[PDB]
Amino acid sequence: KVVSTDEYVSRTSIYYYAGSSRLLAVGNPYFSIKSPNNNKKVLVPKVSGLQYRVFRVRLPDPNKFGFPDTSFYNPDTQRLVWACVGLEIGRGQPLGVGVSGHPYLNKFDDTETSNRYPAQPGSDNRECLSMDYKQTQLCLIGCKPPTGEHWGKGVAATDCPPLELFNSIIEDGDMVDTGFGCMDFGTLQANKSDVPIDICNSTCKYPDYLKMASEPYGDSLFFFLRREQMFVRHFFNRAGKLGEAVPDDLYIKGSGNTAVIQSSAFFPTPSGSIVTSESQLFNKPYWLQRAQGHNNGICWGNQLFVTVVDTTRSTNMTLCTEVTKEGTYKNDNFKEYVRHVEEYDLQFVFQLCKITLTAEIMTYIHTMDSNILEDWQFDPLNKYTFWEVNLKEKFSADLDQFPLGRKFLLQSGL
Amino acid sequence: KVVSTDEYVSRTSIYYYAGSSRLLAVGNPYFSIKSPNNNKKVLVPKVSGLQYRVFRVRLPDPNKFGFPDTSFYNPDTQRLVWACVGLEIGRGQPLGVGVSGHPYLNKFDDTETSNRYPAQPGSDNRECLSMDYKQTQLCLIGCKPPTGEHWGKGVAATDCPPLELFNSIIEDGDMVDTGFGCMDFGTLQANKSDVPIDICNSTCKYPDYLKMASEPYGDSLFFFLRREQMFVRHFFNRAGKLGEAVPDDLYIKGSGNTAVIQSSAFFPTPSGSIVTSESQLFNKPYWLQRAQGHNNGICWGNQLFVTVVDTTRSTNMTLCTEVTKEGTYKNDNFKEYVRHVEEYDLQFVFQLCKITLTAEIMTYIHTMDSNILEDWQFDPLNKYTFWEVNLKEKFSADLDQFPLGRKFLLQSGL
Amino acid sequence: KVVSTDEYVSRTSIYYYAGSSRLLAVGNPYFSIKSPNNNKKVLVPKVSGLQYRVFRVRLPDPNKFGFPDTSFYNPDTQRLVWACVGLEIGRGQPLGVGVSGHPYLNKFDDTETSNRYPAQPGSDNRECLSMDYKQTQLCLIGCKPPTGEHWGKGVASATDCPPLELFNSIIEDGDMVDTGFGCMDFGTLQANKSDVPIDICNSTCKYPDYLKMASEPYGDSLFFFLRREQMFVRHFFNRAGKLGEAVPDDLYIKGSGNTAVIQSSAFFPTPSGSIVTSESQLFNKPYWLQRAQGHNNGICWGNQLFVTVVDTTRSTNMTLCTEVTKEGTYKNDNFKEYVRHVEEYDLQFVFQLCKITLTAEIMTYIHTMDSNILEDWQFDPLNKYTFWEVNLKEKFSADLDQFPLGRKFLLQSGL
Amino acid sequence: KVVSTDEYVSRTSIYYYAGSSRLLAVGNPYFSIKSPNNNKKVLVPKVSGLQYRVFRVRLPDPNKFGFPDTSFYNPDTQRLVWACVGLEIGRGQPLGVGVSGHPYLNKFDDTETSNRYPAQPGSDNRECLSMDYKQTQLCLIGCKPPTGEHWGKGVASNAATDCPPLELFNSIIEDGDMVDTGFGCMDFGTLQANKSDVPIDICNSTCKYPDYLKMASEPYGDSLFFFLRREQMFVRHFFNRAGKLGEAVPDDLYIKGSGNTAVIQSSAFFPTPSGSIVTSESQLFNKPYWLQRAQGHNNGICWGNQLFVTVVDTTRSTNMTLCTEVTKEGTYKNDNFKEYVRHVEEYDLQFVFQLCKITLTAEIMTYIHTMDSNILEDWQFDPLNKYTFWEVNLKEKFSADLDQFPLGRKFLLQSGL
């Protein structure tokens, strides 16, 4: 049914470089700040190292592109399309680790060494704690937005909410899993206090690698890299009513001080250990020679999708303003703010391709995607939020005038 | 006596892909919840990352399979059987570490730095503690269920129970070793308080690699991988009567505060350190080219057994329901639950094989297993618990339409 | 427009070694000590392992150099220039890690395990704490001073949070490298002078703008570079003072009683940089500049060179103690405590002599690239910056086998 | 000027093995013990894993050696000299880490997490602490004693500091000198007058670090025929010093406090190092080194019929605890026992030498004379005694039967003979 793109897409000797300039995002790493009384316009966006970066790269239409010589193909029976052969995801900020927390984190006791009896929380025993998240690096490249998975509230001896595994398109700004799982914390944790504030009212998504790899045409994952790591830093338990009590066959009942059983609703705090330059996935070129899927880097629709997660540059800068100048230090004389920045530099090398439009090939392309033939003269993604990267006026045939272009000339022997 | 399967099983050029869709398991990581009152129906199963996953894959009978052309073998003197040549164990959920504990853990004093004399009074000094288990990855593939070992109570100046090393069939759901050894904690630890609740009334089994490797025909281990790691996090001692006192020649008797000797029954807490993508054993293809045993991947009985242990995705999700909504936080207004999930996607590539049934080969096969000849027209495993994976209607000759199939075509050069 | 130097610069078989003597820097790792008078003359300089070392190496003019035989080129139509083909940055002193701190560090509570309610802050809750910084090794070699980036207070436009602007600047000798708190201007963005230790609290931390220096057309900044950074979070603290941006109400349920007053969610972590090893050392080993990724393949225009070095793996701070009053018993007031830091460098170079035929086309290319190249050849603005001047005009020798890096080059090239 | 020894030293096919027996050093790891007839005679020496081991290996004169056949060279116009081609530094005892401390360590507060105001008064707030030092492995081989560097008290100009002037000193590393421990290579006896800023085994000693740059840049290359090194350490804890802060923090770096924070605390921080972990995989010893081609001009030629092997190995620094019973009683009493600390070191040096001959032409005689006149004078054609070395006399340890020894068999397999 499905065939490789190498069987009906003819490669040419024409190569072009396309590089977006430096992309910056500066905001509050924990929450967005909206402008009153607008209650809809955001003045300071939420920019965190635990966010997905979904770049929608817009490519110019090669069939309407101003080539200096068009004698390499026949516009009467052939159409053109771009193919991605070189890619480098540039990262500018220094290596570092940021922290996230909650002023009312639902932590009762440290259950690691000493947690004797008796013990029973009051009505409000939340604490102001912080932690460092699981370290995650990943990059996905394709002509279709990636598909992610997360657990949500689904649809009786227990009052535990039913869990359902949901698939969704990963949009720019979505939170990645931090060590507490890939779930909808806003709907599955009603107290808003079990995880830090930057995810407590958000949904953490993990890329559904199995689904995106098992799709027939392979438009989602041309190529991908991933490096995750975490360990358990501390051991705590939850405050509140234990919904599922420990059955009687797992322990001998106590008495006296041990008469009232303590909450066995444990939860750990993660830590993505150390970050190193040696483990970096970025600032290095990737050559997309042969993809594992059937689509070998063909950018249908003249568009591209680059998904990036990089927690190795999650440093949160502390800013402090002086409200009142005095000869001695007073806490009420200063205001503290927290800001986070992200610096990207996407570099691409594209290969021009031609497709002879036979009746058989037109049938295959129509069954694959009718919009491909319609646009060739022979939209639903706007409801999602992406980082638009317009490279329509960024294409250049002079490869040796750019870093990735020179690297491509050395790699291919040109 | 025993000969390699390569000497009497003829390989063909026919290959088939078989793919197990997405498999999900959701439950309580510490204990199962049954129906009140039924004591036989289970509403919430026990699903933990420390459990064995024993998949019993059912293969279609090749002698009754609808092949498009059967001119490659002679059904009068030859029989068909499947051989496993390609395998990929798909893993979905993100990497993470979960914790387990006991609200009445038999911990007395922290014996790491400071434990002065005299010793804490009382009859019940158990504490509510938690820990992270030893990290264990392993996968076993074979046509016979795996054999595991565990220490249990045997029959016989100590009242210590006699220890006996037991072999048993590893069933789906059996607990793997967690750092406290592979033993029957339910029978050898009567107080139900020496290990956390998810193993305190269960049996931890470790694969008897030596027995399965030394078996004559080699039906258990076509291929296997393993990666274990742990270290000692904390040092504690047990409360209660020390059954075996330290002899007098190992210490000088004390006086005053040190008049009554403390319990020297020490025990450590493990810690499966850190998880990384670089150390993953799964989500990568295994090519069964030449097995170390005499069975070179022949799936006798048209069945298969895939055993998997993966604690690198043992994250326990915290769920929280709001029973009463109020303007201020109160602990009694919420219920806390703990859930764990597992996502698998088994992918197989099989090679069709033929066996010419000569008098010598029929005698050899009968001495190996009479049921092979009886079923060929020329049951006792139902008492055990396995995860049935029915692939009778999942075979396809179009390898390039699936991920593992494309990987297999690149590997073999076809 | 721009072409590689291999197309218009001809390589010769003449090689020269250049070796700097022993380079030492001794001072206070936290701050410089000036003279009671002028307040501008420095008695004790600031020498810290977290500082950039930007060596401006002066090379002798090859067009005015005394060669024993000048029959290899024609001065009427050709000019000479040096090309760097071998380099080894020698580093002295043992491996070690130093620490920096603040006697009035703005730390309130330890937010890692236990920070229960309620919280009653004061007016001055600063503490005397210390830490060890992020570990950073790097070396940049080029004929142009390096370009670094840092965040400073810009102008723009609401909330009273200061606007952030990304600034580029020339990395000068003595500038502070990022320590785990980011590359920012702490003097202007942290007014209380107490959020980071004293050695950076009134300074600017700069990070090399690798992207800008790599994307420049001629590639004069980065002939070659190495880098190794590492750090992890050691402790978790929170800030004292008014929280400028309060946590929105949709992220938590309000408390009551002891939990009525919310605690400060202005967290900040402490870096560490784990461990240093000899196996991870970037220095004391030769680098051979065979083919650069940029268009400039190691040509040292202007007869000068720039070597940028950061090495926190030798940041040990020596403790000195003087006895003011000698007594039979120990008294704290009888001694004075000092802190000193040292740095030992030994730069070694191997240069290859090159010739350039000055045709009308090549003269136009060089003029559009840099007119000062043609002007000096007979055919300054960097003085406002601070560099470590390394004068090698009288250090060139054609006898390569008489020096360590020269011998290593002779084995490498097969000469 | 300088030429390689391969250009004027002719190699022969004669090889000899020389192996020293088991070398042991047992003593107190923290300080030396004198005795009666004191301050001159030492009963218990200072033996610590943080010490340099500088072996001065004495070789027999090949020109006076009893060879079975002397027809391979002409004694009228040629002279003989040994060349080191094989070496194995054997190390005994198990791997382990020892600790050092000070009963009056100048520690004030733990400045890692909590150090609130105000600060404890006190005239003597020293504490009895210990630590594990930076891990260091190294071995240097040459025909000249090694040159080390250390910071000492210099000479100033008697402008507004009382800080002692620092001077970088070079010196010959003697057997028993202390290696750097993570506090730097300095003279703690002269630069730290209170004798309480570093543990007792270095507080009155000088820590030396090998001046690799000086020994590598020397013309003839007699110091470093070959060398290995592996150092590692990290910061375990954070403390600050007690006493008057000599250099106060300038006013532009902080806002002054008031009340509890009125008196500023000492910002004289110091960390404690910790040479992390030891492994067999990271061992430099118990393995053969083949000195085929040195980076210097001297290709392993043992001028003067002597050799220098410098070794530092902190991977076997375990300090054994000994306990004697002075009074036997039925119950434990602290005053009934005496506690001692001892440290041991076990070495086994193995060598494979190649016999060499040098034809003494007028040009070669001039080159050798300008290099070292004593070479020609001894050939018939002292100042190192003021230093302390571990003499390894191999004059009666040479054997021509290589296959009768471990390193000899390893050398025969390596060279294909």
Author numbering:
A (entry chain D): 20 to 174, 181 to 403, 438 to 473
B (entry chain E): 20 to 175, 182 to 403, 438 to 473
C (entry chain C): 20 to 176, 182 to 403, 438 to 473
D (entry chain A): 20 to 177, 181 to 403, 438 to 473
Quoted passage from the original study:
In the overall structure of HPV58p:A12A3, we note that only one A12A3 Fab is bound to the center of the HPV58 pentamer at a 70° angle to the pentamer surface. This 1:1 Fab-pentamer binding pattern is similar to that of the H11.B2 antibody based upon a low-resolution cryo-EM structure. The interactions between the HPV58p and A12A3 Fab buried a total of 846 Å2 of surface area, as calculated by PISA, with about 80% (679 Å2) buried by the heavy chain. In the HPV58p:A12A3 structure, the antibody binds across two adjacent HPV58 monomers—a and b—with six residues in the DE loops of different monomers (Q165a, D154b, R161b, Q165b, S168b, and N170b), and one residue (N308a) in the FG loop of monomer a. Particularly, 12 interactions mediate recognition between the antigen (HPV58 pentamer) and antibody (A12A3), comprising 2 salt bridges (D154b-R102H and R161b-D31H) and 10 hydrogen bonds involving both the main and side chains (Q165a-R65H, Q165a-Y60H, R161b-D31H, R161b-R102H, Q165b-R102H, N170b-Y101H, S168b-Y32L, and N308a-L94L). We found that HPV58p bearing an R161A mutation (HPV58p R161A) showed dramatically lower binding reactivity to A12A3 than the wild-type (WT) HPV58p, with a more than 70-fold increase in the EC50 (603.0 ng/ml for R161A versus 8.5 ng/ml for WT). Moreover, the decrease in binding because of the mutations is a result of a faster dissociation rate in the surface plasmon resonance (SPR) curves, indicating that the side chains of D154, R161, and N308 facilitate the stability of the antigen-antibody complex. In HaCaT cells, we found that D154A and N170A mutations in HPV58 PsVs notably impaired their infectivity by more than half, suggesting the involvement of these residues in the infection process. Our observations over the HPV58p:A12A3 structure indicate that the side chains of D154 and N170 (chains C, D, and E in the HPV58 pentamer) are located on the inner side of the central lumen of the pentamer and might be accessible for L2 binding, suggesting that these two residues may be involved in L2 interaction so that the mutation on either residue would affect virus infectivity.
HPVs are nonenveloped, double-stranded DNA viruses that consist of multiple copies of the major (L1) and minor (L2) capsid proteins. Each of the 72 pentamers is composed of five copies of the L1 protein, which can self-assemble into an empty T = 7 icosahedral shell called a virus-like particle (VLP). HPV L1 VLPs are excellent immune antigens for prophylactic vaccines, as they authentically resemble the native virion in capsid structure and immunological function. Here, we describe two antibodies, A12A3 and 28F10, that specifically bind to and neutralize HPV58 and HPV59, respectively, through two distinct binding stoichiometries.
